[PDB]
Each structure stands twice: as structure tokens, then as C-alpha cells.
Amino acid sequence: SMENVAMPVVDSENVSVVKKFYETDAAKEEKEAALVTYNNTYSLSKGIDLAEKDGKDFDVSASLSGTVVKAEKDPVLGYVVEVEHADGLSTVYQSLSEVSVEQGDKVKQNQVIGKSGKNLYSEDSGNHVHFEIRKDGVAMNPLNFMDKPVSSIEKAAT
Amino acid sequence: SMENVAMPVVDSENVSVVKKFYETDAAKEEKEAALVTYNNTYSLSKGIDLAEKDGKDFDVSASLSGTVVKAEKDPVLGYVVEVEHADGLSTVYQSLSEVSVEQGDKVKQNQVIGKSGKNLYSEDSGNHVHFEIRKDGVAMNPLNFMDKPVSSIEKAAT
Amino acid sequence: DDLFTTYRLDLEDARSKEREELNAIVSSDDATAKEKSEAYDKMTALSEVEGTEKQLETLIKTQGYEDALVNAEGDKINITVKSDKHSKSKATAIIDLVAKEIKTMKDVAVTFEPS
Amino acid sequence: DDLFTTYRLDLEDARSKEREELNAIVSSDDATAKEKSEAYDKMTALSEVEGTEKQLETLIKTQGYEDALVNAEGDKINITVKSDKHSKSKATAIIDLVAKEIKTMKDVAVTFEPS
């Protein structure tokens, strides 16, 4: 609360979004490109993927302040961190190589919490972080909320 | 009531059953032979078919006393007569060439009510009558009830 | 034109509407206890009909039929099977898949459509 | 072994048991109003899930898929399609068949199995 939603990175200028959150009303091409491809499994993207121009490692940081409710290495997802904020809101960082937090850690906004990495889940996004904002468990488009006060999020659905 | 279930024919000695009521626990052969065949439709037999040795016409008669609740020519079934008895019991005569009754007629046991005929529905039973006993609408095996008092019928299910 | 997909579609549509109305009665301040109770029974039976048809269809398919369609809703059970050859043999093996209490209480018909 | 028929069978079995338990709670003198009410909601949602899966399957099949299987029960919707070729194209045309409010609230996965 009282704060704005931040890019989950420290050096935000040196990364780009390489995959977007799936939107059902987007053109065919954009839907195709918002797919998570595993083997002969496709799944919908429930967040954005950020990668650096040359796919070098980079530090991921908390998009908002909260409490780390999850921090674990998954053999398919890489490290996965999930930070609880106010009002059933929470954020998810996943595909991490390293973690700088553990369950129960309180973090502050922009506090580094891990390092980008590659993944089994989306090998197509190379070295990256997958990032998600969820309200009471359901994933919404990150790009919709970037730099907006915490509240503009809890004012959808309507 | 008070009476026994009769063969639905006047000259019972000169006809034979040419199709039986379908029983799920009978041998394969007997199940196969208790099928009603239409075109590439098969249906379960819900009664017996009676025909005379040389498939000559013969007179059908009421198996029990009651009130004719139905009497009409059906282009697939031939004439169909349905006689209401006591206690949701009732009998069905179908494949008739002719009818000697009409809706609302009270008939007595052995009173002729029509003539055998051929049918579209079961062409395989040639010139015959299809006969059914139903309790509250559901068809039971006629052969189970032949010559038994009216009551032995209303004492299944159990 | 493909008669199977049209039928399944129309059946579904119809079923949906059905559930919605049952649910509507059951949920309504203006229904009597009797009416709620009966709508509720029609509702749970419908599910079981739904379950019966899906399972029957799955079973038939396992018997080497390329596709099958089964409507178990009324007084009769209608079953349509894709097939070029049909016989009393084949039909009776299909009717064998149907529950006893169904065959005891209801007629059962099995049609074989050119594949 | 055929994975589709096994799954449909096991799903059904499982669903049956499910309905039976929901019905059992709803019908029980020992359930509270809250509990009946929630069991009742789980029951009606399940039907709708049932309906959603049957319709989705029918639709896909109409799009030239030889068979399809759809489980819409949980947080994710799983859809398995018989097919030798798979692509981002093909998958997205399948995901297009799914309701908006599903895609808005739930993940959706589509797997293409060798036919």
C-alpha cells in the first residue's frame, strides 16, 4: 500500500520483456507469442518474462514490500519466490538461478531477492525471470500495473 | 383380480411363441433371438410374439378383463390395443390387422379384440401378435405370468 | 454435415438449459418444499444419466467401435454406433454393457450408422 | 494399453464418487446449513465443469481432431488432443475454444499426443 508497483529488477533499463501475459483478445500473433512451450505441451503465460540484451545474469528484486512466503528450487521452474503483500496481493518470481531470501524474510521494494536463470519450463525465454502479480491467487497482466499505485490493482474486477 | 392370466388367443393350441421377452441373464443365443430388428436398429423384446404354424391369421383376445384405453392403427406397429386392468396392470396387443374394439370399450377375458397381422416393426415374426403385460408402465415377461392368478404379478419387485 | 457432433452439441445445449431450470426452482423462494425436492431429484438423476452415457460410450469405444453416442434420458436408451457391419451378435454385445436395472425398466435401442 | 479410455474411465469413477458424497452431505440431517449450501454449490459447479468438458471436446473434434480429452475441474484446465503435428498455431486455435472467464481465472494447458 502507498507504494507503486515496480519492475522486478535493479537495472530496469538493461532488460526487455521477452514474453507477455496471455490476453484472449490480442491478435493471433500476440497470443501465439504469449504461450509457454514445454514439450508438446503449451500453457498460457501468467506473467511477463524479462531478459537482458545478451541474456546475461541479472539481479531480480522485490517489486513491492512484503513477506516471503515461498522460496524453493523446483527442478522444472528453477528457484521460485513468492512475496506476500497487502490484501491478497502477492508477486511471483521464478526461473531464478539463485535466491537471496528464505521463507519468512520480510523484504522491501527493490531489495534484491535472486538472480535470473534459465529453466526447463520456458527454455524459449532463455536466461530470464518470470514475474507475476496475483490477487487472491489469480494472475493479472503485470504490464497493466507497472508504476501504478498499489490500489489501481484492487480496483479490478468491476 | 380373481382371475388368471390367459394366453391372448382363442385357439391357444394352434399357435406358438416365435419371440420371447428379452432376459439379460439368458444365453447369448436366447438374447440374440429376443431382439426386435428394424433396419439397422435393434431393440429389446418387451413381450412375446405368437404366430400360427403356417402364419395364417388368427383371432386375438383379451388376456384379462379391463377397459380398452387405446386402439389405433400405427403405420409401423399395425393396430395397437392396450387394455387397462386393476392396479396399474395393463396389457398390450400390437401387430393387429384388425380391431374389434375401440377406446372406452370394457372387455372380458377371452373376448376377441382383433386379428393377427404383419408389421413393419418386427417383420421377422411374420404374421403375429405382439403381447405385453405391464405394471405401472413397465413390461415384464409374459411367460412368467401365464395361468397364474392376477396377484402373483403384483408380488414382484421384492 | 456430421450428425454426431450436431447431436452432442444440441444435447448439451438442452441439458444446460435443463440444469439451469432445475437449479432455478430449487433456489427459489417461491417454490414449495415438494417442488424443490422434486427438482432436486430430477437434478441428481440427470447427473447420473450424464455419467451413464459417458461411461457407456467409453466402454463401447473400447470394444472396437470408432465412435458411439448414447442418450439415456427417457423411457428408452438410444445408442448409436458408427459401423458398416451390424448384426444380432454385435448388438447384443453392446446391450450387454448396459446396467441390469436399466434393461429391466427401460427399452434399449442400438442403431449402427455407416462409417 | 490406451491412455484416453483409461483416463475417461477413472475420471468417471472419481466423478461418481464425488457426486455421491456431495449428495450425501446435502441430504444429511447432521450437516449444517452452511455445509449443505457449499456441498450444493460444489455439486452444481461440477455439472457445469462436466458440461464444459463435453462441449469443449465436441468443439475440438469438429476442428479436425480425431479425439480430444478435457479436464476442467481444478485451477488449470488440461486438454489433451490426439495429433502428430503440434504448433503454436494449432494450440492457440484450441485455446480459443475455451471460455473467456476460464482463461481469465485459470491456466489452460494443451498437450498433443502421437496418434
Side-chain angles (χ1 to χ4, degrees):
Chain A
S1 274
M2 7 155 266
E3 57 186 28
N4 293 10
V5 169
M7 282 283 279
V9 153
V10 174
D11 187 9
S12 30
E13 292 261 0
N14 200 208
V15 295
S16 58
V17 176
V18 287
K19 186 201 296 319
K20 291 173 189 173
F21 172 104
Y22 191 89
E23 300 269 49
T24 89
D25 63 11
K28 191 178 100 152
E29 230 63 325
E30 317 244 35
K31 285 190 290 187
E32 262 164 320
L35 286 181
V36 164
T37 315
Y38 200 2
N39 299 268
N40 339 72
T41 278
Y42 305 77
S43 141
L44 294 191
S45 163
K46 288 313 202 155
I48 63 190
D49 289 351
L50 288 160
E52 179 271 327
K53 197 269 254 61
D54 290 287
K56 298 165 195 191
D57 279 354
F58 59 88
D59 301 290
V60 163
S61 48
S63 164
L64 293 159
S65 313
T67 301
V68 169
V69 289
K70 195 209 267 208
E72 22 184 274
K73 162 85 220 276
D74 181 282
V76 170
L77 300 184
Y79 274 96
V80 174
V81 174
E82 171 171 351
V83 178
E84 170 117 317
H85 314 95
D87 303 333
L89 231 210
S90 69
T91 34
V92 179
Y93 313 78
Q94 125 175 350
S95 212
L96 307 197
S97 287
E98 322 181 11
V99 158
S100 309
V101 289
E102 74 187 320
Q103 232 200 293
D105 286 347
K106 256 79 224 225
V107 293
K108 38 201 166 57
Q109 176 157 57
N110 292 102
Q111 190 185 144
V112 158
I113 65 188
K115 213 171 282 314
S116 86
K118 329 192 196 252
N119 229 355
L120 280 171
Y121 203 66
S122 26
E123 339 216 319
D124 80 276
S125 302
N127 174 348
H128 71 285
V129 56
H130 182 72
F131 170 67
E132 294 181 4
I133 320 76
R134 311 193 113 128
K135 162 83 165 137
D136 304 295
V138 44
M140 314 177 73
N141 189 332
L143 291 201
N144 278 354
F145 308 129
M146 269 318 140
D147 307 309
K148 290 169 173 173
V150 76
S151 322
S152 72
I153 297 264
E154 148 130 318
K155 89 158 239 150
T158 56
Chain B
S1 274
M2 7 155 266
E3 57 186 28
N4 293 10
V5 169
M7 282 283 279
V9 153
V10 174
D11 187 9
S12 30
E13 292 261 0
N14 200 208
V15 295
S16 58
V17 176
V18 287
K19 186 201 296 319
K20 291 173 189 173
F21 172 104
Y22 191 89
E23 300 269 49
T24 89
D25 63 11
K28 191 178 100 152
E29 230 63 325
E30 317 244 35
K31 285 190 290 187
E32 262 164 320
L35 286 181
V36 164
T37 315
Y38 200 2
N39 299 268
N40 339 72
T41 278
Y42 305 77
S43 141
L44 294 191
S45 163
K46 288 313 202 155
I48 63 190
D49 289 351
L50 288 160
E52 179 271 327
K53 197 269 254 61
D54 290 287
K56 298 165 195 191
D57 279 354
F58 59 88
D59 301 290
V60 163
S61 48
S63 164
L64 293 159
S65 313
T67 301
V68 169
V69 289
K70 195 209 267 208
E72 22 184 274
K73 162 85 220 276
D74 181 282
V76 170
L77 300 184
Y79 274 96
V80 174
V81 174
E82 171 171 351
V83 178
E84 170 117 317
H85 314 95
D87 303 333
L89 231 210
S90 69
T91 34
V92 179
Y93 313 78
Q94 125 175 350
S95 212
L96 307 197
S97 287
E98 322 181 11
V99 158
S100 309
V101 289
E102 74 187 320
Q103 232 200 293
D105 286 347
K106 256 79 224 225
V107 293
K108 38 201 166 57
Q109 176 157 57
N110 292 102
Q111 190 185 144
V112 158
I113 65 188
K115 213 171 282 314
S116 86
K118 329 192 196 252
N119 229 355
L120 280 171
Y121 203 66
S122 26
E123 339 216 319
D124 80 276
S125 302
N127 174 348
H128 71 285
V129 56
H130 182 72
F131 170 67
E132 294 181 4
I133 320 76
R134 311 193 113 128
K135 162 83 165 137
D136 304 295
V138 44
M140 314 177 73
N141 189 332
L143 291 201
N144 278 354
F145 308 129
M146 269 318 140
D147 307 309
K148 290 169 173 173
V150 76
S151 322
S152 72
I153 297 264
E154 148 130 318
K155 89 158 239 150
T158 56
Chain C
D1 205 358
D2 164 27
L3 284 184
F4 272 63
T5 37
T6 310
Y7 191 87
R8 284 215 184 78
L9 282 168
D10 295 342
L11 185 50
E12 251 19 88
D13 298 353
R15 306 284 243 244
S16 273
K17 267 163 267 157
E18 262 217 81
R19 294 187 282 280
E20 130 155 21
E21 268 145 33
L22 280 344
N23 192 11
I25 288 138
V26 159
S27 305
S28 149
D29 280 357
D30 292 294
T32 69
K34 211 83 74 78
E35 309 169 75
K36 293 195 165 95
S37 183
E38 292 165 11
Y40 183 79
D41 295 9
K42 277 178 201 168
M43 206 181 306
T44 54
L46 219 217
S47 292
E48 291 309 323
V49 156
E50 298 284 0
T52 288
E53 315 185 340
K54 297 173 72 162
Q55 199 210 67
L56 224 309
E57 313 209 37
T58 306
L59 293 161
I60 319 270
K61 280 187 308 206
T62 89
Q63 301 299 122
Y65 291 100
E66 170 228 315
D67 199 356
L69 168 66
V70 171
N71 173 333
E73 199 173 14
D75 277 348
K76 207 216 280 202
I77 312 313
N78 282 99
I79 298 176
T80 318
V81 144
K82 264 284 198 82
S83 190
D84 286 308
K85 299 130 72 68
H86 62 301
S87 81
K88 297 227 190 108
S89 253
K90 294 209 185 213
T92 203
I94 290 179
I95 291 165
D96 291 342
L97 314 168
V98 177
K100 273 170 196 31
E101 326 62 28
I102 293 315
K103 279 170 299 181
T104 293
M105 300 296 165
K106 285 167 177 177
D107 184 20
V108 169
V110 179
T111 310
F112 300 67
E113 294 275 25
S115 78
Chain D
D1 205 358
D2 164 27
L3 284 184
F4 272 63
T5 37
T6 310
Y7 191 87
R8 284 215 184 78
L9 282 168
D10 295 342
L11 185 50
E12 251 19 88
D13 298 353
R15 306 284 243 244
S16 273
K17 267 163 267 157
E18 262 217 81
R19 294 187 282 280
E20 130 155 21
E21 268 145 33
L22 280 344
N23 192 11
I25 288 138
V26 159
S27 305
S28 149
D29 280 357
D30 292 294
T32 69
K34 211 83 74 78
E35 309 169 75
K36 293 195 165 95
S37 183
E38 292 165 11
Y40 183 79
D41 295 9
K42 277 178 201 168
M43 206 181 306
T44 54
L46 219 217
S47 292
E48 291 309 323
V49 156
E50 298 284 0
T52 288
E53 315 185 340
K54 297 173 72 162
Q55 199 210 67
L56 224 309
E57 313 209 37
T58 306
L59 293 161
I60 319 270
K61 280 187 308 206
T62 89
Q63 301 299 122
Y65 291 100
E66 170 228 315
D67 199 356
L69 168 66
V70 171
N71 173 333
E73 199 173 14
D75 277 348
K76 207 216 280 202
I77 312 313
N78 282 99
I79 298 176
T80 318
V81 144
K82 264 284 198 82
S83 190
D84 286 308
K85 299 130 72 68
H86 62 301
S87 81
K88 297 227 190 108
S89 253
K90 294 209 185 213
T92 203
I94 290 179
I95 291 165
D96 291 342
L97 314 168
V98 177
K100 273 170 196 31
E101 326 62 28
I102 293 315
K103 279 170 299 181
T104 293
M105 300 296 165
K106 285 167 177 177
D107 184 20
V108 169
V110 179
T111 310
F112 300 67
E113 294 275 25
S115 78

